[PDB]
Structure formats: structure tokens, C-alpha cells
Amino acid sequence: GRLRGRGRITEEDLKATLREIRRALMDADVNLEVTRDFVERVREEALGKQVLESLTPAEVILATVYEALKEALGGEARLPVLKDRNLWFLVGLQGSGKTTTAAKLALYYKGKGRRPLLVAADTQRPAAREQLRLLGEKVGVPVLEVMDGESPESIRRRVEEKARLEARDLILVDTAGRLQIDEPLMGELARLKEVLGPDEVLLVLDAMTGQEALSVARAFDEKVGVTGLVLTKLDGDARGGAALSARHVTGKPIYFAGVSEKPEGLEPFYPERLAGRILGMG
Amino acid sequence: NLEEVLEELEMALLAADVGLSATEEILQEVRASGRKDLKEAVKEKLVGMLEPDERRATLRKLGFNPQKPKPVEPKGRVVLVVGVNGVGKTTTIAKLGRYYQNLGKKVMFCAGDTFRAAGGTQLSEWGKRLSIPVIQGPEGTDSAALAYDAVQAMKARGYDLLFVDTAGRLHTKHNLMEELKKVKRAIAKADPEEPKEVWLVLDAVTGQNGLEQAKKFHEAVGLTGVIVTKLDGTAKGGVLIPIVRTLKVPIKFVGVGEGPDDLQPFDPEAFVEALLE
Numbered sequence: 001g002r003l004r005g006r007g008r009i010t011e012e013d014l015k016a017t018l019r020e021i022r023r024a025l026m027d028a029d030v031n032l033e034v035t036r037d038f039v040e041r042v043r044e045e046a047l048g049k050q051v052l053e054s055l056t057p058a059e060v061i062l063a064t065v066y067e068a069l070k071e072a073l074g075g076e077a078r079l080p081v082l083k084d085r086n087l088w089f090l091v092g093l094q095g096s097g098k099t100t101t102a103a104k105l106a107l108y109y110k111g112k113g114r115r116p117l118l119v120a121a122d123t124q125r126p127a128a129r130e131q132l133r134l135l136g137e138k139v140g141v142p143v144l145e146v147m148d149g150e151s152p153e154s155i156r157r158r159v160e161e162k163a164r165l166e167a168r169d170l171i172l173v174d175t176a177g178r179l180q181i182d183e184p185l186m187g188e189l190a191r192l193k194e195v196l197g198p199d200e201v202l203l204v205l206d207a208m209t210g211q212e213a214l215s216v217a218r219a220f221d222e223k224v225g226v227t228g229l230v231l232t233k234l235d236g237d238a239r240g241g242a243a244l245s246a247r248h249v250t251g252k253p254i255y256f257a258g259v260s261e262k263p264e265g266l267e268p269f270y271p272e273r274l275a276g277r278i279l280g281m282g
Numbered sequence: 283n284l285e286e287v288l289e290e291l292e293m294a295l296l297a298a299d300v301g302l303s304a305t306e307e308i309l310q311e312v313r314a315s316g317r318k319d320l321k322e323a324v325k326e327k328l329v330g331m332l333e334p335d336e337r338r339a340t341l342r343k344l345g346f347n348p349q350k351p352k353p354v355e356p357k358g359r360v361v362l363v364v365g366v367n368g369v370g371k372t373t374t375i376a377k378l379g380r381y382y383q384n385l386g387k388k389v390m391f392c393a394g395d396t397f398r399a400a401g402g403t404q405l406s407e408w409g410k411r412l413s414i415p416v417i418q419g420p421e422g423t424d425s426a427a428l429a430y431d432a433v434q435a436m437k438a439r440g441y442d443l444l445f446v447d448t449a450g451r452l453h454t455k456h457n458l459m460e461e462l463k464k465v466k467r468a469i470a471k472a473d474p475e476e477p478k479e480v481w482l483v484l485d486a487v488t489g490q491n492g493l494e495q496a497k498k499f500h501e502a503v504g505l506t507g508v509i510v511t512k513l514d515g516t517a518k519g520g521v522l523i524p525i526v527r528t529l530k531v532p533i534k535f536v537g538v539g540e541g542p543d544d545l546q547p548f549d550p551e552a553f554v555e556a557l558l559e
């Protein structure tokens with residue numbers, strides 16, 4: 001398993017190496033089923049490829065793995081395309097980082113000349129509205145707080161009025177955290193979506209999320225139609241395999257990376273960098 | 283036959299976030315037991331990797347069956363709650379207040395999160411709902427000084443328990459971890475024998491990074507217990523296996539909702555049954 005260009009990749013080389021790759025992906029928290037598909041994808045791509053002069057069979061397979069991973073994660077950075085009017089939803093599991101991400105997005109775009117409006121739609125978590133209200137003050141962006149029991153139609157009414165009177169062109173709706181299997185709440189999210197009509201629905205996923213990332217992404221996507229993702233808490237040391245799991249089942253772009261607890265802690269997501277991270281290059 | 287069952291079991295454990303290391307160690311042992319009905323031997327084994335206090339486990343092995351459960355009780359009067367951002371620290375404290383107030387205890391809370399927006403007001407609101415006093419300060423107040431004041435108030439008023447909330451922090455930030463140690467030192471300054479309990483909060487949906495979190499917080503403040511939240515979801519909380527096996531920290535409670543009563547004492551049997559579906 002350590003010789004220079006003296007043969008094409010054999011099925012015997014793609015059994016010893018990919019077994020280690022499968023383990024690395026699992027340790028990185030990439031979902032099991034996603035890992036088998038990825039390994040079998042590499043097996044097909046590498047199957048019987050030439051191992052030039054220089055390069056060992058291992059190196060060629062490792063290169064194939066990294067390239068496949070980079071591609072599966074998005075290839076190159078990609079940010080949302082904004083139009084005259086934009087209304088986005090931040091959705092996801094309890095504690096993923098939605099409220100903070102909404103404030104980060106507001107600051108990021110305000111700096112780009114947009115005029116954002118933050119909408120605190122979480123009325124179940126104690127002090128949730130105060131939380132976004134405070135962040136709004138910190139980033140210098142208006143915050144509309146939904147009232148207890150307010151209907152989707154009423155929310156739409158007030159959001160429309162405020163956006164018009166204050167010339168807002170990017171409305172960020174921060175929703176409460178909910179389990180992807182909570183029928184009542186997932187139904188409420190779907191109804192809010194049909195009434196408000198978001199141009200983007202972003203699933204905020206914690207980088208430390210484990211094997212269930214797959215089911216979580218699929219449920220939110222099938223119930224409310226995810227258009228993109230935000231991977232938070234990347235300033236931690238979690239490998240971030242949940243990102244590949246979410247990408248694999250939704251096919252949607254991972255727009256941003258959350259890299260700190262501060263409002264400025266937002267940046268474009270780079271497939272290349274997470275690929276290395278998942279493989280343990282950092 | 284058995285090889286298909288072991289293969290099935292491996293997938294089930296991995297899907298539950300148990301990890302490769304622990305999963306292989308479990309299957310290797312079960313395969314060596316010669317037991318015909320795996321799964322059951324596995325359940326028996328797991329109901330062992332979910333309890334370091336030892337004795338109750340040994341009793342079932344000697345053909346005995348002594349039980350009692352008995353409401354979980356803090357060793358002392360102060361409980362320091364720690365964990366990374368978003369896991370459920372604040373809400374778990376509210377639930378612990380409800381749990382112990384139902385047992386007749388006089389409970390007080392310390393809104394130690396003076397860092398995050400509404401971090402303290404959130405706990406204050408829970409205290410109001412539960413008629414539990416909450417010591418809090420303006421955002422930016424020194425958490426250690428607040429904790430010290432909280433312990434002093436608890437002693438002066440004759441309260442039985444004080445739960446100290448802390449701001450969320452990633453285990454990879456040495457400065458924030460030092461702050462946590464400062465909070466523990468402030469508590470001991472107000473009462474030399476405290477805190478008797480330091481409980482880590484873990485989100486059931488967390489993958490293998492959960493082991494690193496547990497290791498780092500344990501190294502920083504010496505954990506005496508762990509609470510796993512959000513088990514009402516689809517995640518099984520399997521990372522607890524490697525954690526309890528490597529750190530020997532007991533699981534105290536499980537969080538199963540966002541209501542004041544959505545807390546249950548940890549039950550090894552039920553947990554393992556759910557983990558294996």
C-alpha cells in the first residue's frame with residue numbers, strides 16, 4: 001500500500017482505504033447512510049484509475065475523496081441573491097442559533113446597503129422577544145415583536161405596514177425552535193410560510209449536530225421547503241459532518257457559517273474548508 | 283443469523299450516536315458472551331454503561347433485584363449548571379426548581395448568565411412563574427460576584443437549594459472556561475463546602491463532540507452529574523455511553539419538553555430500550 005505508480009487502483013486498495021475513510025466520516029458525525037453512499041460513490045469514481053508516476057494508490061484515493069467531499073458540500077462559496085423585496089425565515093431545532101443568526105444577517109446586510117427588519121416571531125420561549133429586541137439595538141436594526149396569540153394574517157399586516165413606513169427591504173423572521181416531529185408546531189410553521197411567502201427559508205444547523213441531522217433536514221425541507229442553510233458554532237471543534245448530511249438530502253446551498261457568539265460572527269461558508277475539517281485537516 | 287443481528291445492532295448503535303469506539307467494544311463483548319439472544323445481552327450491557335454508582339448493577343448480576351429509585355437528591359445546597367451554548371441550561375434549571383419545590387424544598391436561582399442578551403431575564407421570568415426567587419444583575423455584571431451574592435442570600439434566608447445558571451460557552455475557549463472556574467471559586471468563598479454538585483447539560487441531538495464537551499468541562503470544574511435534554515425528539519443521546527464509560531459521571535435527569543414538568547429522573551432501563559428503538 002506504499003508504492004509508486006505501478007498499477008491501477010484495485011478493488012483491494014479500495015477496501016482498506018475506504019474503510020478508514022468511512023470511519024473518519026463517522027467520527028465526523030456524517031450520517032451513516034450518507035457515509036455509505038459517499039464511500040460507494042468514491043469507489044465508482046476511483047475504481048480502476050491510473051496511479052501515474054509519483055503518487056501512491058492511497059494518494060489518488062485520498063485526492064478523490066477530498067474532491068468528492070468539496071463538491072458534495074457545494075464546491076465554491078455561494079451567497080443568496082437578493083431582489084427588490086426579500087422576506088426570509090430562520091428555522092430549526094431548539095437552540096441551533098436562529099435568533100443570533102437573524103441579528104448577524106441583519107448586520108451583514110445593513111453593511112451592504114440593505115435596510116433590514118427583524119421579526120421576533122417566537123412567543124413561547126420566555127424573554128425571546130426581548131432577546132431579539134436587544135440584539136436589534138446592538139446592530140442598529142428595527143425589531144417587530146409578535147404578540148401572544150397573534151394570527152399569521154395579523155403578523156403579515158403589521159410587517160407590511162412597518163416595512164412600508166420604514167422602507168425596509170430585507171425582512172428576517174426569527175421563528176421559535178421546534179422538533180422536526182412536532183406536528184402542531186411544524187404545521188404552524190407551514191401556515192406562517194403560506195401567509196408570509198418567504199423568498200428564502202434557512203435551516204439553522206448547529207455544527208455539533210449528530211446522526212439525526214439527516215432526518216431533521218429532510219423533515220424541515222418536506223414540511224416548509226428549505227432553500228438554504230446556516231451552519232453555526234463553527235468556532236467550536238465539532239467536525240461538522242451534519243453539514244454533509246443536510247446537503248445530501250436537501251441539495252440546498254450552505255450560505256453562511258456562524259463563527260462566534262457576536263453579531264459580526266458571520267461569514268460565507270466555504271465547502272473547501274469544511275471538507276478539510278471533516279477529514280481532520282484542522 | 284447472529285452475524286446479521288450483530289450487523290444490525292452495529293447500525294442501530296451508530297445511528298443512536300454511540301460512536302465507533304464504544305459500538306465495537308459493545309459488540310465484541312456481546313459476541314464473546316456466547317449468548318444466543320443478542321439485543322438482550324446488549325441491553326443488559328448498556329444498562330451497565332449508563333451507571334457508574336455500581337452497586338445496583340452488581341445486584342441484578344447476583345440474581346437479586348433490589349430497587350427503590352428514590353428521588354435524586356443534591357449532595358449539597360448549591361448546584362452549578364454548565365454547558366455549551368444552546369443545550370438547555372436555563373430551562374433545565376426552571377424544571378429542577380419545579381421538581382424540588384414539589385418535594386417541599388425552598389429553592390432559589392442565580393441568573394449567572396450576565397453575558398447573553400436576555401440571558402438573565404429569561405431565568406427571572408421562570409422564577410416568577412414558579413414563585414422562586416432569582417438573583418440577577420444588569421447584563422455585564424461579573425458572574426462570580428453574582429454567584430457569591432446568591433450563595434450569601436441563600437444562607438441568610440435559610441433556603442435549601444440554589445441553582446446557579448451560567449452563560450453558554452464553547453469548551454474550546456480557555457478564557458471562558460477559566461471564568462467558569464472563577465464562578466466555582468466565588469461560590470466556595472461564600473460557603474467553603476460548596477458547590478457539592480456541578481452538572482453538565484447535554485443536548486441529545488449532539489454527536490461525538492458531546493464526549494469532548496464532557497471531558498473539557500469535567501477537567502475544568504469536576505462534574506458530579508449530567509442531564510440530557512431534548513430526549514422528546516428523535517435523537518437517542520447515545521454519546522452518553524462513551525461519556526459515562528470514560529468519565530464515570532452519573533446521569534441525573536432527562537429533559538423531555540419545554541414545560542416546567544418535563545423532567546424525569548434518569549431510568550437506565552427505559553433509556554436503553556428507547557435507544558435500541
Ligand SMILES: Nc1nc2c(ncn2[C@@H]2O[C@H](COP(=O)(O)OP(=O)(O)CP(=O)(O)O)[C@@H](O)[C@H]2O)c(=O)[nH]1
Nearest residue numbers: 094095096097098099100177233258259260261367
Ligand atoms: N460560539 C458561538 N455561539 C453561537 C453561535 N450562534 C449562536 N451562538 C450562541 O448559541 C446560543 C444559541 O442561541 P440562540 O440564537 O438563542 O438559539 P435559537 O436557535 O435562537 C434558540 P431557540 O430555539 O430557543 O429559539 C446562544 O448562547 C448564542 O450566543 C456561533 O456561531 N458561535
Ligand SMILES: Nc1nc2c(ncn2[C@@H]2O[C@H](COP(=O)(O)OP(=O)(O)CP(=O)(O)O)[C@@H](O)[C@H]2O)c(=O)[nH]1
Nearest residue numbers: 094367368369370371372373450512537538539540
Ligand atoms: N423539546 C425540548 N426543548 C427543550 C428542552 N430543554 C430545553 N429546550 C428548549 O431548548 C432551547 C434551550 O434553551 P435554554 O434553556 O435557553 O438553553 P441554554 O443552554 O440555556 C442557552 P444559552 O447557552 O444561550 O444560555 C429552548 O427553546 C428550550 O425551550 C427539552 O428537554 N426538550
Ligand SMILES: [Mg+2]
Nearest residue numbers: 098099122177
Ligand atoms: Mg431563538
Ligand SMILES: [Mg+2]
Nearest residue numbers: 371372395401
Ligand atoms: Mg441560558
